[PDB]
Symmetry: C3
Subunit: 442 residues, 3 copies
């Protein structure tokens, strides 16, 4: 994780990388004052017309428009790819925290530039954008909500080191000279922002670029290694949990937030208190390093949100002891096995971060199985491949004092009593280990 | 039609087959107390990745959630198909009547097992599910809504004769042993439910599994047999109506219901009273023995709902004599020609069932045409093939005293006055014949 | 532009062609009293099952149903196409002004007939439809909303010169003879309307029916002609605006309307006053002579509506001096570069039509560029091909006193200051010329 800081229009500008959304080609967290934006850039493995998609979304907890902002950010980026480049490139901008005086739109634009800049994609940037106002005869960079009310110009201009790349303006009937001056006043700031990004690029130094029978032979090799040689594809032992990392309080305008990472699975859960309890779960395709349609929550996202809500509902305080609504949203930023349990753990952190008087913290974990002729092997904290090539995905969440939720998917006829018993015990040990880590963080 | 009865958690469990949704591969009506669920299983004719889809819907008149339940029922079913089976299989569960103390989710799960078991699809069941509660230290099968409020466990468990295959639980922090005790307490009931299903299967004994030039010769033969030999593809006479069957009062929690069957066309219409008149029409793909997307009402269903509403609107009493809202929903469970008129007849039955003081009963029927030489033949109650290969689809509904609705689709340039007049006369005789039967039923 | 007038059920019937939607195969404006309906017919260039789609929409500003009305109009039209005809034919019906006593449905039915008749598509019409009521024992053509309340019959019947082609009725239990009399009373009016349509057809006389290297040589030829010979594909000069045409007050039940045409780009903007400011933009596929899905407004339509709203927002009077909501909807009836600007102009004419005390009229225009070596050429009022084959699409709108909106898309890395300077000045001259024309119209 690398943090780069500067100042922008009288407020702090930080760009973070290396920690969040590692399976996108490039990903960056932009903090502009209290505005926080996660920007990702992901490209298809092989080339597909150049298919570029830019998305912008302001989360409900951050406090047509988003369509206009995605079209805004697409413009200075689209023409700067090599001629003939046909890979499908998808860029996401998620406003996690929104201060209206610290333009989330412009933060997302430089986030989208930086996401691409560190990314692996041959984008010919960097670019940056600024908002220019025109107040009492003086041009201003990124005016506050108050200043924009007395501004005769609502100009957003973007470009690179060499030239202006985009002009998007509304104005109170200003002359051609007044506009022209505003534009190249804006481009002076753009050159500073592009220089700031280039410092980051210089430091980071991104590097730019019968079947079915085979599929069964790999399945048997993974299963043989596990049952016989006692070793898992990532070198783990059968009861080994992946490396754990965790933080709270990542978002200034949220009541509570928790970041929980387990191996290659990472979830950001954001809590909102209002004036009863709900938990939602979002699974972007950049979480698994892919592109594709940005659709409404599918069947799986509805399930995993309800499973998280079920595990957590039992420790939520009553209304007499906590007279507030509680909404938690879990964002899966990276996934390689049980994002849904990571969302449960992130939500517990966010509940404690927000000072919600819960009965007890809750953590979860998913168990696996490799069945063989004479015996079987329980796998603790399975990754995706062990789900795909194993025999079950057995998810258990609860407190130190017992179970609050179970959900199971198996690829065999059934689980014997001994399998279920052994899995529940390893899962009891697993959740206890995870909460020891979470209480260490909290 | 065969009815099989038992007792389940202190309430009656009935499974019916042979009457409803005969064009699905397998179909079953489950009655669990006042809960009523129709479950169908339909497979693609040819095999296609194994595409299995399970659907669950609680109808508005029965009284995220439905997604979780379809997700619930898929789990114990999916792994029990032969390895390498690639037919597209769709399972539909329609909650027609819902008593919250008599689990519609569990009723639908055994319905889906039952639908598959009698179906011809090589499903390796049967399976069954139960809900297990935990109240003052004792496990209970399918607790009532009141009992679940004092329950420390919300466990739903499914499996087959030999093993448990699915566990989905919420719990007030119960230990691993307590959960284990609940699972195999539930599985004792599952083995009883699967044994009951096997009794039904033992009795029923399901058996398990230039082009354009040709079509014109087929069309030419059906039309030739009709015009020359006066015989229709099913052997009917040109003015012969298909066998009629009808009952009332099928749903305990509905204000009125009518089941109307005409040959291979079957509609169940459900009426709801409230505190002005609407008729809706649903056409599931299993009604014609197919699979496919479950979409919102298409143009045809909207058309056929409005045509049903038109035929019926005229005999609905004034508010002074009946001060209630009336919503009727007609479910096409099978189709082979004019489901829309069957829905009209089903709706009239439901109106008389509900004790709605209608002006007069209403029946409908669809007429056809085969034009030849200069001669022609009017067909009474056309099936699908006579619509496709004939010249018109001429639908007339009304009372014994006259016409209340007409809708027509033709495949030739126009209908002469003489064709229209003779068709109207045969349809007058038709609706009178259908109505004589409906009053016999009512 | 040709206008054909007659009388229909005691109200005026006008059919207009030659002015609106010229890029559809056939397009017609029908005025039936105060009802105004635009009807278009467009066919795919090559044939694809005969795919015919009929669409019907009543605009909100004109004052299940639209689906039923579109199916209504499809029926008398569908069977009257040549056997074996496989071109995709799409008919759109847009109710721009709605008087409920002058049936928009029947206006749309004869509009769809006329659209196809003048179209080049081998539709074997014309057809027409009428509404027949039955009041105190007398049949009446197209009864008023009041008269329909005392009518025992709500019959819609359609057909051609030779026969009735469609019967759709609801009725208060009328006999077969009463229904039969109604149909052929209606067909007496149909033959008169079909004769009226036939007069127009006689008058108009419609006539009835390495790749990558090649595209790059065409692009180089357009750019070569522009930069060297100064000649544009339509023979225009680089600073020449396309011919302008403009009218105001096209819709009787709208508070204001403006029609603005610029070459092959045409927009109709409709203003509605209520008891704050919004501008929407619609882009039908017939505007460029194509067929295809009728979807919700896409990203471009959202963008172009907001850009129009942005150009206009600045001249909207304050609430203190104009206490009304203002809604404008701009319909792109024909397009060949910058419809977004056509909407702005249309909107301004409309605001003036509606007597909205705007600060100043607003006009817009789109500029292009052909870059050659170190040389370049600014293009005034670019058509679609000069956008596709040029270097920018630079849109500037404003008043006589300055700029109110700018939006730009470029196909090169950046725009030098002098290019931006040259574009703004030519665009300033452009909008002044357009506004000189618009004030002449107003
Ligand atoms: Mg897992
Ligand atoms: Mg029919
Ligand atoms: Mg343009």
């Amino acid at each position: 994780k690398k943090v780069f800081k500067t100042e922008w229009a009288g407020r702090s500008l930080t760009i973070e990388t290396g920690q969040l959304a590692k399976q996108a080609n490039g990903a960056v967290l932009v903090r502009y004052g209290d505005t926080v934006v996660l920007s990702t850039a992901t490209a298809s493995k092989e080339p597909r017309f150049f298919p570029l998609t830019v998305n912008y979304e302001e989360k409900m907890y951050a406090a047509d428009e988003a369509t206009l902002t995605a079209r805004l950010i697409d413009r200075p980026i689209r023409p700067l790819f090599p001629k003939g480049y046909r890979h499908d490139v998808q860029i996401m901008n998620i406003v996690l925290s929104a201060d209206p005086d610290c333009s989330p739109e412009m933060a997302a634009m430089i986030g989208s530039s930086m996401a691409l800049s560190v990314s692996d994609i041959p984008f010919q940037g960097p670019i940056a954008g600024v908002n220019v106002g025109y107040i009492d005869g003086k041009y201003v960079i990124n005016p506050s909500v108050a200043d924009k009310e007395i501004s005769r110009l609502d100009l957003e201009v973007a470009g690179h080191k060499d030239a202006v790349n985009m002009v998007e303006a509304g104005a109170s009937e200003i002359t051609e000279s007044e506009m022209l001056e505003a534009i190249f006043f804006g481009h002076e700031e753009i050159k500073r922002l592009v220089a700031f990004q280039q410092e980051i690029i210089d430091h980071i130094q991104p590097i730019k670029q019968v079947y079915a029978i085979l599929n069964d032979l790999i399945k048997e090799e993974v299963r043989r290694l596990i049952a016989d040689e006692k070793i898992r594809p990532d070198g783990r032992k059968v009861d080994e949990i992946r490396p754990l990392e965790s933080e709270v309080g990542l978002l200034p305008r949220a009541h509570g937030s928790g970041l929980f990472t387990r191996g290659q699975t990472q979830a950001l859960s954001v809590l909102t208190l209002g004036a009863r309890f709900m938990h939602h779960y979002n699974f972007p395709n950049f979480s698994v390093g892919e592109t594709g349609p940005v659709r409404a929550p599918g069947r799986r996202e509805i399930g995993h949100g309800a499973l998280g809500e079920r595990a957590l509902r039992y420790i939520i305080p009553d209304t007499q002891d906590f007279p507030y609504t509680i909404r938690i949203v879990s964002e899966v930023l990276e996934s390689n096995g049980s994002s849904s349990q990571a969302s449960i753990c992130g939500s517990t952190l966010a509940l404690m971060d927000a000072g919600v008087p819960i009965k007890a913290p809750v953590a979860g974990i998913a168990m696996g199985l490799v069945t063989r002729d004479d015996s079987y092997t329980i796998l603790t904290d399975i990754q995706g491949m062990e789900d795909a090539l194993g025999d079950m995905d057995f998810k258990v969440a609860g407190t130190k004092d017992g179970i609050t939720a179970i959900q199971m998917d198996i690829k065999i006829d059934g689980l014997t009593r001994e399998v279920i018993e052994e899995a529940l015990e390893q899962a009891r040990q697993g959740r206890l280990a995870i909460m020891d880590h979470m209480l260490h963080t909290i």
